[model samples]
Target chain A: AEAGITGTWYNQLGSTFIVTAGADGALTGTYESAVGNAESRYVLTGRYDSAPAGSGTALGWTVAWKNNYRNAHSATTWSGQYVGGAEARINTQWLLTSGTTEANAWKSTLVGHDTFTKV
Target chain B: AEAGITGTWYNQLGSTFIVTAGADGALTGTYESSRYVLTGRYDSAPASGTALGWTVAWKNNYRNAHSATTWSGQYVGGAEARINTQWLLTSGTTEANAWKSTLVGHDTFTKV
Candidate 1:
C-alpha cells in the first residue's frame, strides 16, 4: 500500500509532482506547473488513508499545496486506483472557496475534474 | 554543451520529458503523456555547434510504437525558452494506424 502513491505523478495539464510517502500515511512533494509562458512551483503535503472512511478508491489521498510563488494555496482531493496493475489513475477535484480565504488564491474558477496518472 | 539541455522539460499540455545528457552530448530520456496515459523512452543525438537541438528515436511501451522526433530551440536567458518539435511515425502498427505519419508540436519549459 505504501508503494501505491509514492512516486512522480503528473496531471492532465502536464504539471509535475514528485511525491514521497511517509510511514504514517503522510505525503510530501514538490509540484511544478507550466501554465502559459511562466512556471510556478508549490510545496505539496497531504495524507492518505485506505477505504471505508475515505474516498472509496484503493488508496485515498487528500493533498494541499502551498504555492511557492504567491500568497496562495490550493486544496485538491484525490483517489488513487491502480491501472493495468502498475500505473495509477488519479481522480481529482479542485475545491472552490470564496472571500479572503487561502483557497481563493487559486486562479481557476470552475471545478476541476482532472485525470492524473503516475509518470 | 551537455549541461544546456540536461533536465526535465514540460510542454503546455503537461507532458513530461526527463532528459539526461551523456558525456558526448548524446541524450536519453523518458516521456510520459497525460493525455493518453502513455509512456515512452527516447534516445537523441545532439546537433553540432552552439544551439541546443537534437534528433530523437522515441519508442512507446504499451503498443510497441515508435516515432522520429526532432527538437530545436534555445534558452532565452534564465529558465524561459521555446522548443520547436516535429514527430513522425516511421513504423509500428499501433502508431501507424492511429496517428498521422507526420505531426508538429512546440513546447517551452523553465527550470524548476
Candidate 2:
C-alpha cells in the first residue's frame, strides 16, 4: 500500500519512469529515457501485474512495454521489484522483443538491468 | 512502472471506486455508494503533490435532483490498499435541498 509505485522515479542512467495504480490494482504508466546518442530518447507505454513481495517491503511486478515509434513497433518485458516505504527502489531485467509479437519466444536476451530511485 | 490506481475497485459496503491515470501520472476518478444513495464523481483534475496523492473536486449528484453540489478532497493511497480520503465542500448553497459546503467526514475505501 505504501504508495505502491505510484510516483515519478528515475535511474542513474537519467531515464524517467512514471507509474500509476488503479483502484482495481491494475497499473498503467510510461517510461522515457533521457538524452542519449543519435537516438536521443526513447519512450514506452505499458501495463503491469503485481503481487506483494515475500520480504513484506516490496512488490514483485511484471511490466511490459510498447515502443512509441510507429514503424519500430518494439516491445519489452520487465520482471521487476518495487520496494515500498521510503527510499523505494525499482530494479528489473530489461528484455527486448525481437519482433512485433509479444510472445516470450520473440523476446531477446537480457539487455541489462534497470535500476531506479524514486524521485 | 506498474499500473497505479487506474481501474475499478469496490469496498465491503457495496461502494465503488474508479480511478484513471494520465500520461503525466495525474490521478482522477470517482466514488459512489449505493447504500448512501449519493454518488460523488470528479473530472480529469491535475494532481497537486504525488501521483496517487492529489486534491480533486467532487460533485455529488442525487438520483433525480440538484446538480450544483461540489466539494474537494485530498486523496492519498494506492491500489494495494484502501484510499484514505478527506472531503470538504468549498462552493454552492448550504441549506436544506441545497449544497452544503462542509466536511463530509473522513473516509477510507479498500480495494475489492
Candidate 3:
C-alpha cells in the first residue's frame, strides 16, 4: 500500500529524481541536477517492473540535457533497483553518451554510479 | 581488462536487455516486456574472465501475477558474443495449489 518508487529521491551529486508516475510500470518523472547546466530540469521518461528485488521496483529512465561543453547532443539512461522498506534506496548505474556525430558514431560513452536514498 | 558487456542483447524468449554499464562490480540494464528492471552483478575485475549474475523481477501485471526470476550466467565475447546460463522462475506468492510455480530452464543470449 506504500508508494514505493512514486516519491522523491536524492543522489550524492546533489541531483534530485522526483518520480511522479510509477503506475503500471509507466515511469515518468522530473530530474534536476547540481552539475552541468545547473538550473535546468528535464522531464524523465522510462519504465519499471515490480519483480521482487527485495521489496522494490526495477526501473530505468532517460533525460535529455540542454547541451553542454562536452558534446552538442547528450542523454543519460539509468537502470537500477529501488528497494523500499524502513530506509529506501535506489542502487543504480548510468551511461552518458555524448560526442557522437554521424562522422564519428559511438564517439564517447562513460559509466558511473549513484546511490540515491529517499527519506 | 574487464570483459565489455555494454550493449544490447537478445534472448530466445524475445527478451532484450540493454546493458548500460558494468562498473564497480555491478551491472544495470533495461529489460522490456512490462519493462522489468535488469539489476545484478558482474566481475569488473575477474581473474577467470567474463561472468555475470542478475535478475528480472515481475511486478503486478494483474491479479495472481506474482512472480520473480533470477538468472545466473557468464558472458563470452569475441567474434560471436554470448551469455550462457540457467534461469529459475517462481510465481504464485503465498498461494495454495501452486502448479508450475517453479519453472526451470536454460537460455543463451546473443548481442544484436
Candidate 4:
C-alpha cells in the first residue's frame, strides 16, 4: 500500500510537498517547487516499498530527497525505510540557496540513499 | 561608531550577509552573492551610527536580500532596519541548495 504525503516544505521560499498515491500502490511523491513564483514547475518522482512490516498500530514515515543543481534534469532520490517507532526523521541534505533562477553552484545532490532512523 | 555585521543570508536561491566595518567610520557591506553561484556584484550602501541604533548602528542590518536571478536590485534604501532582531534567525532554516539565477520580485524596502 502507498500513502499520500502533504506538507509545507522549505528549501528557500517553500511551497508545498504533495506526494500522491499511485495506482501501482508503490506510493509516488512529486513537488511543485514554484508555488506562487513565476517559473513553471519542477517535478520530482519517488517511490516507497510495498507491504511494510510493523505492529498492528500505526507508524510514521519521512523521506528526504536531494538533487544536484549542477546537472540539470536529473537528481538523486532517497527515502527512509518503514520501521516501528514513535517517529522518523528523513535528513535529505542538499546544496545551498543563492540566486533566484534555476542555476547550479549553491545546489545539492543526493550521493546515496536516504539514511533513516528514530528521532 | 558602527559594527560591521556579516552572516549567512538567503532569499530563495542565493548566498550570504557580509556587512564590513568602515574605512572612515560607518560600516559598509558588499556581497558577491554568487561565488555561491554567478552574477557580478551588488552594493548596499550604509551610513554611520551606533547602537544598532544609529538610524543605522549596525542598522539591525541583516540587509536580507535574495535573487530570482542576479542583478535584481532592492526597491528602496534602508530596508534593512525595521527588523526587530530579524536577519538573526539563520538557523534550522534549511539552506536547501539548488539555486536560481536572479530574483524577479520587488525589494524588501523600508522607510527611514
Top-scoring candidate (DockQ):
3
Which candidate number would show the highest lDDT if scored against the true structure? 3
Query: Which segments of candidate 2 are over 4 A away from where they belong?
Result: A35-70, A100-110, B1-112
lDDT of 2 at A6: 81
* Per-residue alpha-carbon lDDT of candidate 3 for residues B1-112, written as tens digits (9 for 90 to 100): 2336788888988888877654454456767745656555454443322445455546544422444455545566678877765555544322243333456666778886
Candidate 4 residue-wise lDDT, B50-104, digit = tens: 2231111121234433322322232221435321221211112233432322112
Note the clash tally of each candidate.
2, 12, 2, 28
- The candidate 3 chain A region of ten consecutive residues with least summed lDDT is A66-75
Please report the TM-score between candidate 4 and the true structure.
Answer: 0.27
User: What lDDT does each candidate get?
Assistant: 0.40, 0.38, 0.57, 0.33
On TM-score, who's better, 1 or 4?
A: 1
lDDT of 1 by residue, A5-24 (tens): 67887888887878775564
What DockQ class does candidate 1 belong to? incorrect
B52-100: candidate 1 lDDT, tens digit per residue: 3333233223332333333333333334533333222222122223233
Model 4 agreement with the true structure over A1-113: per-residue lDDT tens digits: 44322222333344344455454544444444432232333445555544444432122223322333322333323344443335533344332222334454333222222
Better of 2 and 3 by DockQ: 3
RMSD of 4: 15.7
TM-score of chain A of 1: 0.63
lDDT of 3 by residue, A4-56 (tens): 77788899988898875444455566778878644556655555564442233
**Chain B TM-score against the true chain B, candidate 1:** 0.54
